[PDB]
Symmetry: D2
Subunit: 326 residues, 4 copies
């Protein structure tokens, strides 16, 4: 009975605001619905395949990457609530024209889970929202803030159902898209992650490159020293999907640094920070294995960061291993 | 431009038939669309949660399990094309009333991927269709046929998009549900799996219970003896999703027997056989590690069977390991 | 709980048939759903406007006319149940290719209510189905049968909701399109028109050209000689809409001959006959004012015919006036 | 490419506002989408039939009347933009609770075209928005303002497609609901009615009770004194549908006073004023036959008013007749 718009408006009225966050989120929701509709019939629309370009990270851009990126950029611009936009698919930050300029800075991953698009596995959209602090003209530097400065973050999950997970200062709430009326309805309030889970999520195909800590941790999940039941393994392959499951089922999700990648694979501004924020607001933890993800001060809008997140007791157990090896 | 109905009708006209297979599939498609619609808004409809019962396999029945089961049973009965139905959610085979009795026997998994329902990860519906051979009245024995006797098999995948994958004697074809008109449109014709993939899919949380062959194979995927790139790992957790990815991306999917489960976990009649059939029609292989899944003569409608399937070169590599250890 | 497919299949099984009528109707339903979806968002799709051509009747062809015509022609051809097609938008009858040739002849109005398209008023699709009687090759003559030879007829109404009204030998049934699953669900069984209504439907803008009978009848509806309540007037402007209301509310619908049009405006094969058939199966009447519409033997596939239809007592009252003036 | 939200926000930013009008309209749009979805499948949902009550006007309340009323009342309350609500289905004005109280007063007809619901003919929702002028606590008197005080007005038309027609100080714009993404998209900008049309819309079943002016006018439309082509007649029966057609095709719509009804049938606050406002903003006229509808100062929230509206030359022609008879 409660839409995302209604929820955000009331929450914003309690925080004494102008209403552009509601404007920003309402706009973001429109793009998310458009992306969801395209995704649900991508094959019919011939939306699978490459776009013929590579982004800064080196990823081969896909058709849905371009569509989603264009949709998000346009709705945020027209929202009159943003001034600086950072996207995985754009080399440099996008500065909104003076006329439609707002007070928020948005970092987003238009379409997360690239490798899972063609096999119809869950994909999504990730976003992190900051308030412009500076007084000078808007620039890329405005997006180089540590995650702990986020005022809102979340993601749209295009899975069996489309879910918009939104985290703000007071907590995390899940809204499900009702395809019939095109509205996101609140379905899970003040979500909190279990203190300890029973699922570990990591691509073990990188075993040869894992550091001693990750290696020891995985071995521990498979062969509990206390004869407890081994953890079950789950790795969908799309960060949004694995992280969402971690949030609602508990457990741990890992994309750590490895011999070949000092800073892991996932991008700090639009993948790691948003999810770290959602996790901490849900009572979970998010670390690189040596420091809290949200405390990292970025120097590159496309910089990568190792990330280990989920239930506090699980993340802590891994942190102790990193400490032990240090 | 080609619907599943049109495809099946023409293919059936070439095989000189009465048309009940088209009737059966048309009916199945209606249930699949109903399940898809419910799944896409399950949270809004309060469809997440347990049903308050356990099936023969011992699974805790979920709300979507009951809904999907009822929908499939009703449409198949009214199809006038079936005589015996076997469902994961029903203790004994369902014998269709004389009046609406057809010539086909259908084994199905109304909702596959139970553990993934609540976290919105891909789930689906699996089916295997047989032609009644006996001349006597229809009974459970009519469903106890080896998979190689299947005349049609496939699955509906409720992922980022809803796909109906259908395999018949001539090959495998993928049809995507167009939400706007409620029709499955052909999007992938005569699908063939790659001879060798680069993804292995298995729940490694069972490492402590794996046999020496599975153990050696996994280690080989992580540390290629020829210094080739290690395989990537993917395990969505829903058989339909992992198998579909295996079909379109290549690679291998495994749910082998282990120290605790002599016959693995997956069910032969409505999970293993249908997927084994799809795989073989796509040029892939499906084995228990010691024998072809489709050649097993079942004695229990709910019996389990180990299953290793996917690209022929990958499955063969594992088979050689089993042989080596034998 | 009962789909149109299920209804037609069972009704056909009682009539001992091959099943192509079910095939024909299933195919027609697919086109109807496609037309409905396009219509519901025609403005967004830029589907309003002229096509740049005029048909035999002299109507200015519209974009939706072409789209609907193409959809209906293609699905009927691929149905494998038709041999001759007659459309308002095609100069000559369309002979189905030998390979996909069936036993039925279909006369249809792909999009009825042309003048109401742009103002978003109800429009629809009308069809009449005949069984080929001849033994020789299929030709236009096969469509020149009197309406009383119809085996099925009806219409799709794209109004506040999309309804498929189907009339066959046993009666008239209404099925509503469920947008969520793309299936027509039975909502009104064995529909029967009221013996006498209280609504008269006619374009009175033609008053100057009406014959004495129509003139006297209208005056009688406005000034009842028995001081009864005057009839209410309703004229949506789309035959499908006015006729549907006549069916479910009772009353009379008129598009009579006039000084300028000896045979009225509406077309016999794809407008008048189908509606006359629906009406008679519902216990209503359909006359030109001098003879039953269904008994007219056509000589032109695009010939026009005056038509007065609806509740038997109302139509009879008008018939007596025509008789009185004769 | 432009949504109603985007349009209203920009238009409001030009008028220097707080943004609650955008909030109000966004909220209204949500209710309209919910009503549209229910209407499009009303038969399936068993939404046809009476509710078991009668409103102040004496109308037999229908199921869709209650549903639509509840939806509109709830979204407007939660909008935080209204203080007083007037509905056809509510005996007295509804005063919004202090906490969610806004500055606007809204008069609405939750579901217009009652008699057309069951025959699936076009129906809709009509609304008129005023700014609270008083300084004292909100009361029914706040809704008793002349229509010329309206700041916004329009209607949702649930016809072949769902259209939201919005009129504000700068003009009239049409937005069509895209069922796929649940967003109203601008499809007709700055709509202007033709100076003179060729369609007259009135229920001639009331001929016995019409005044001499209406009687002479109709006769003139049928028998032009200058031998011009007679006007065509159209009377859908739902004010929203007939008025919309009048807007986009031109012509005249009439529901005048008659011997039995001194003030006609239509209600001033939620039917006549909104449509009169839309008409005048489109360059049309709206009169009772003796005075402009928008200048009437209401004394009863449910008072009726005669209404004649449409193309200026047509309305003027009728006005001259009223003058001539006066
Ligand atoms: O194939 P890998 O190396 O496990 O990478 C998977 C990761 O790639 C991403 O698609 C980012 O490129 C994430 O969504 C996902 O977590
Ligand atoms: O959690 P586990 O043991 O990996 O089981 C996963 C399997 O369970 C199933 O849901 C069957 O119960 C399959 O769909 C899936 O492959
Ligand atoms: O405008 P007129 O002459 O009343 O014609 C209306 C008729 O035109 C049609 O569109 C056929 O051309 C019918 O659907 C409708 O009954
Ligand atoms: O049946 P009548 O008297 O022509 O009334 C029709 C009018 O009734 C209404 O439904 C209002 O009650 C309007 O929408 C429509 O214009
Ligand atoms: Zn990427
Ligand atoms: Zn990503
Ligand atoms: Zn991305
Ligand atoms: Zn189960
Ligand atoms: Zn299963
Ligand atoms: Zn199951
Ligand atoms: Zn025409
Ligand atoms: Zn027509
Ligand atoms: Zn037509
Ligand atoms: Zn009413
Ligand atoms: Zn009304
Ligand atoms: Zn009303």
């Amino acid at each position: 009975d409660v839409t995302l718009t209604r929820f955000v408006m009331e929450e914003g009225r309690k925080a004494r605001g102008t209403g552009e966050m509601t404007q920003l989120l309402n706009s973001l929701c429109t793009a998310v619905k458009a992306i969801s509709t395209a995704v649900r019939k991508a094959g019919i629309a011939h939306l699978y395949g490459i776009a013929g370009s590579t982004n800064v990270t080196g990823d081969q851009v896909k058709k849905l990457d371009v569509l989603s990126n264009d949709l998000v950029i346009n709705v945020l611009k027209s929202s009159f609530a943003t001034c600086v936009l950072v996207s995985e698919e754009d080399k440099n930050a996008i500065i909104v024209e003076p006329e439609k300029r707002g007070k928020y800075v948005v970092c987003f991953d238009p379409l997360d889970g690239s490798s899972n698009i063609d096999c119809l596995v869950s994909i999504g959209t990730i976003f992190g929202i900051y308030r412009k602090n500076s007084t000078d003209e808007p620039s890329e530097k405005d997006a180089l803030q540590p995650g702990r400065n986020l005022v809102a973050a979340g993601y749209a999950l295009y899975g069996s159902a489309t879910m918009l997970v939104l985290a703000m200062v007071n907590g995390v709430n899940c809204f499900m898209l009702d395809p019939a009326i095109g509205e996101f309805i609140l379905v899970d309030r003040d979500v909190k992650i279990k203190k300890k889970g029973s699922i570990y999520s990591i691509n073990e195909g990188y075993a040869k490159e894992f550091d001693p800590a990750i290696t020891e941790y995985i071995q521990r999940k498979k062969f509990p020293p206390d004869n407890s039941a081994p953890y079950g393994a789950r790795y969908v392959g799309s960060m949004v999907a694995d992280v969402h499951r971690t949030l609602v089922y508990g457990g741990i999700f890992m994309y750590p640094a490895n011999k070949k990648s000092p800073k892991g694979k996932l991008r700090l501004l639009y993948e790691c920070n948003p999810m770290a924020y959602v996790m901490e607001k849900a009572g979970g933890l998010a670390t690189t294995g040596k420091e809290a993800v949200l405390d990292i001060v970025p120097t590159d809008i496309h910089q990568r960061a190792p990330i280990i997140l989920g239930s506090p007791e699980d993340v802590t157990e891994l942190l102790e291993i990193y400490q032990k090896h240090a």
